[PDB]
Amino acid sequence: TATFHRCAKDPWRLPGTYVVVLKEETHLSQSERTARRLQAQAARRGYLTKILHVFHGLLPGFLVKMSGDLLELALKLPHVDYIEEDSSVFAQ
Amino acid sequence: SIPWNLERITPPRYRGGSLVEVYLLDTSIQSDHREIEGRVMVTDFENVPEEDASKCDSHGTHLAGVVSGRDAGVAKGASMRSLRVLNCQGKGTVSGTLIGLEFIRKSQLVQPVGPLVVLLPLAGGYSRVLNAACQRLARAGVVLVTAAGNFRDDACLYSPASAPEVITVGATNAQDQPVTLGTLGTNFGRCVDLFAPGEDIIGASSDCSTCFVSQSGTSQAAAHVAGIAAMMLSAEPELTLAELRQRLIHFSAKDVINEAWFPEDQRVLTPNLVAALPPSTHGWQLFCRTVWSAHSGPTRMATAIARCAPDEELLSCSSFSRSGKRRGERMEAQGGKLVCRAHNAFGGEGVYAIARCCLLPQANCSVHTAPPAEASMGTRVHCHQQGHVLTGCSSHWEVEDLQPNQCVGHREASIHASCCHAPGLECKVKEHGIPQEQVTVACEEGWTLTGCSALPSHVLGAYAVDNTCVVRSRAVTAVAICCRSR
Numbered sequence A: 001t002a003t004f005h006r007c008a009k010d011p012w013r014l015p016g017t018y019v020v021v022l023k024e025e026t027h028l029s030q031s032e033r034t035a036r037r038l039q040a041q042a043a044r045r046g047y048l049t050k051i052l053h054v055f056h057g058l059l060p061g062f063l064v065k066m067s068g069d070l071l072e073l074a075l076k077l078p079h080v081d082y083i084e085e086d087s088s089v090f091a092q
Numbered sequence B: 001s002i003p004w005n006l007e008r009i010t011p012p013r014y015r016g017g018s019l020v021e022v023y024l025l026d027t028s029i030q031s032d033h034r035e036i037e038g039r040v041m042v043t044d045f046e047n048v049p050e051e052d053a054s055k056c057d058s059h060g061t062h063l064a065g066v067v068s069g070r071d072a073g074v075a076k077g078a079s080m081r082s083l084r085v086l087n088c089q090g091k092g093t094v095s096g097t098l099i100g101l102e103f104i105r106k107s108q109l110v111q112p113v114g115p116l117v118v119l120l121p122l123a124g125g126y127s128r129v130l131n132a133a134c135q136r137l138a139r140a141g142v143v144l145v146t147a148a149g150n151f152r153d154d155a156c157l158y159s160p161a162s163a164p165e166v167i168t169v170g171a172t173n174a175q176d177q178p179v180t181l182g183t184l185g186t187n188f189g190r191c192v193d194l195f196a197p198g199e200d201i202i203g204a205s206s207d208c209s210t211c212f213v214s215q216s217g218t219s220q221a222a223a224h225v226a227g228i229a230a231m232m233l234s235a236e237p238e239l240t241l242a243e244l245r246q247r248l249i250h251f252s253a254k255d256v257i258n259e260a261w262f263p264e265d266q267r268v269l270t271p272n273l274v275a276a277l278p279p280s281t282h283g284w285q286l287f288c289r290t291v292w293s294a295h296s297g298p299t300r301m302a303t304a305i306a307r308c309a310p311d312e313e314l315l316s317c318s319s320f321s322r323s324g325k326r327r328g329e330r331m332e333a334q335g336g337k338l339v340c341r342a343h344n345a346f347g348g349e350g351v352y353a354i355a356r357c358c359l360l361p362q363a364n365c366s367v368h369t370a371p372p373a374e375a376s377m378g379t380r381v382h383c384h385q386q387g388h389v390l391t392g393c394s395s396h397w398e399v400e401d402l403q404p405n406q407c408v409g410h411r412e413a414s415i416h417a418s419c420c421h422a423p424g425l426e427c428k429v430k431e432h433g434i435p436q437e438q439v440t441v442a443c444e445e446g447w448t449l450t451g452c453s454a455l456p457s458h459v460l461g462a463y464a465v466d467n468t469c470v471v472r473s474r475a476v477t478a479v480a481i482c483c484r485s486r
């Protein structure tokens, strides 16, 4: 059910930083647990991950600094709605 | 003496922002500048990417000045709150902007205030998460104003410009022409709500506390609308997001922009509206706006769908194709609310679903459908009950190739009538026929167009341009339904 998305404008793309967006009614406790689960499953595969921020208030989820290789593993995690690769925004 | 931009937004009759607070998500700002001194609170929020001292504050100071400026501002002396999401080069991240928007909501939940206006004078590529964050912040009761973009492209391919809940603003000059930022320029299309002054805009300069600089861009344009909305919400604090959007469109200047600058196919989708403050005069009036759906494509099964706001009523539905190869349109109900669906025919590149979304409170609206009669009389359906008015006619045909309160269609096509029970509403049908590529019929002053359709010989389609019904062909008759408050 979970899908991956990245910016269509290739020079504006920021690989290595991902926004994991969870289901509409996912609670903050579940969001943090899903982030720690990702870190645990990624540590077993020999990959180092960093949870930069945990989202709550508007959308449930978290900001993770990890290798793209873990995306398939991350899309399989519970409560995951979609994952988006971070991208640049510019002053108009 | 008075800057050109502040005069354009001034209505033909006239006489803020204490009650309303305006959040700015741009670069760092010179809070000590005399133009914005004591009225801007720097949150000192920082989530900016690494740069690869006065040049940093340049973009944010000007915009804070365009919004709350004492001498050159739209909403003079308005309470402002700035969040830094863009670095010294005016560059940020989607993630940083998400944390920025979350902070505004967290601040709102901790210490609630009155109406809130969030100005996002930035743009990146289409972002699913950023558009979703903008949607949820709008659901919460926050007004979001964004820049269309300076890429001389369709605003729908940029974020937060394509978020349906936000107010996307394009830029125009003193000649009411679209701004040309060197090689590029202002963005356009169905995602743009309206335009606002965005060329040679004088505002606060970060160089010195009293200095002034002239700047151009969709950021400057969006800053005018953020200021206009802050004053509109100061006058009417009970305004919902659908209400404010309808007010901005209704009080805007019409047919002033020369469509020539925009690509042919985008000329129609792009709204010819230039932002303006409301006049002194404005009981209740009927507000309507034209919504254009995303191009359906080359799929016959996948159809173009035009939607309205949850507190907005769909009063009519029409369809368009530049080739004229379509299978009509339908007013189908979905999840308790009406949607406008457009069907595509064989050999047709695609179709547009054009809907008329109106603010109609204390009124009950329904759809009256009739399948093909296959007889000489033609497919007909009518609003039978008393106190009910016809607002729009839709017609779709599954075939490959071909009176008051009544919808008339083709014998091989289905017909859809929109009937509303509004006792304080007077509706009329205005028609115009010519034996020519374009036929127009317009509602008079004080009357709001609710329905636009073509009398059933080959037609490209029909669309509403403000209170004028436009029918495209290669006789041809344009049908307009004009309504008003009695």
Ligand SMILES: COc1cc2c(cc1OC)[C@@](C)(CC(=O)Nc1nccs1)NCC2
Pocket: B156, B161, B162, B163, B164, B165, B166, B167, B168, B190, B191, B192, B193, B291, B292, B293, B294, B307, B308, B309
């Ligand atoms: C991706 O599609 C759109 C995107 C956008 C807008 C409109 C869009 O489609 C019609 C408008 C013009 C606003 C608008 O009308 N909103 C609507 N909400 C629900 C139905 S219409 N500015 C923001 C971007």
